[PDB]
C-alpha cells in the first residue's frame, strides 16, 4: 500500500 | 540497533561534484524498501532530493534534474550521493534517511521515513 | 508538485494550554480511504523526527498529547498539553507522490 504517484511500489 | 551515517567534505568549490556517504549499520541496505537523500538549507527548509529503490532503480527531484546522481554498494552496505555543477545555493545540511514500512492499524502497513542520519554539514565556497 | 502551506509560520503558547497548527495541501492526499499526511518534529541540532503518519497514527514512544487529523487537503497536528521540551519546528510531509515534498515549518515558541 503505496502512494498513487510513487515510482516504485511494495509488491 | 539501526544507525545511519554521512560522510564527505565540508568545503566544495563551485562547479565541482560532491560526494556524499550515508553508511548504514545495524540494518541491511537490501532490507528496506527505499533510501532517501535530503538536504535542509540554512532557514530550515527542506528540499527531498531523490532515492534509490531496494531494487536498485531510482527517482529524482525534476529540480535537481541531470544533476544528481545516487548509487550504492551492497557489500559496504553504503549508498552515495553525487551533485554535479554544485554553486553556492547548494550549501545545506544533508541528511540520508531510510523510508521503511510502519506497521499500523489493523494488521497493514505505511510507508514513512523513520529513521535519518545526524546529517552533514556541506559549504560550497570558493 | 504538491505545494503543502503551514499556518501559522509561528506561535506562542503556555505550558498546559492547547497548540494546533494546520497544514493545506494544493491537492488532495487521500487514496484507498487514507491520507499520506506525515508529521516531524526537529529540535535544534538535530535530524527531524517522525511523530505522525498516515494523518492521525503516531509513532513508538511518542506520547498521546499529540494528535494529528484531517483529510483531502486540510490536515492539523494538536498538542495538549503543551510541556515544555515541544519547542521545536514541525513540518507536514506528503507520500501521496513522487517528489515527496514538505512544509515550510511552524516554530513553536513557548510563553513565559
Known amino acids: 500500500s503505496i502512494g498513487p504517484g510513487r515510482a516504485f511500489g511494495g509488491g | 540497533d539501526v544507525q545511519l551515517q554521512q560522510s564527505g567534505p565540508d568545503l566544495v568549490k563551485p562547479s565541482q561534484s560532491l560526494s556524499l556517504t550515508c553508511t548504514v549499520t545495524?540494518?541491511?541496505?537490501?532490507?528496506?524498501?527505499?533510501w532517501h537523500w535530503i538536504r535542509q538549507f540554512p532557514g530550515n527548509k527542506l528540499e527531498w532530493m531523490g532515492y534509490?529503490?531496494?531494487?536498485?532503480?531510482?527517482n529524482y527531484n525534476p529540480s535537481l534534474k541531470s544533476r544528481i546522481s545516487i548509487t550504492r554498494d551492497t557489500s559496504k552496505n553504503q549508498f552515495f550521493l553525487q551533485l554535479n555543477s554544485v554553486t553556492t545555493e547548494d550549501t545545506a545540511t544533508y541528511y540520508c534517511?531510510?523510508?521503511?514500512?510502519?506497521?499500523?492499524?489493523?494488521?497493514?502497513?505505511?510507508?514513512?521515513?523513520?529513521?535519518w542520519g545526524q546529517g552533514t554539514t556541506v559549504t560550497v565556497s570558493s | 508538485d504538491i505545494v503543502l502551506t503551514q499556518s501559522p509560520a509561528s506561535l506562542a503558547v503556555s505550558l498546559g494550554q492547547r497548540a494546533t497548527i494546520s497544514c493545506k495541501a494544493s491537492?488532495?492526499?487521500?487514496?484507498?480511504?487514507?491520507?499520506?499526511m506525515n508529521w516531524y518534529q526537529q529540535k535544534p541540532g538535530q535530524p527531524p523526527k517522525l511523530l505522525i503518519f498516515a494523518a492521525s497514527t503516531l509513532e513508538s514512544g511518542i506520547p498521546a498529547r499529540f494528535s494529528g487529523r484531517g483529510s483531502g487537503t486540510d490536515f492539523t497536528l494538536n498538542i495538549h498539553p503543551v510541556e515544555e521540551e515541544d519547542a521545536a519546528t514541525y513540518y507536514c510531509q506528503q507520500s501521496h507522490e513522487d517528489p515527496l515534498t514538505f512544509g515550510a515549518g511552524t516554530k513553536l515558541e513557548l510563553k513565559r
Open positions: 534517511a531510510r523510508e521503511e514500512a510502519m506497521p499500523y492499524g489493523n494488521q497493514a502497513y505505511y510507508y514513512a521515513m523513520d529513521c
Open positions: 534509490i529503490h531496494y531494487s536498485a532503480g531510482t
Open positions: 545495524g540494518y541491511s541496505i537490501t532490507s528496506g524498501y527505499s
Open positions: 491537492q488532495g492526499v487521500d487514496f484507498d480511504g487514507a491520507s499520506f
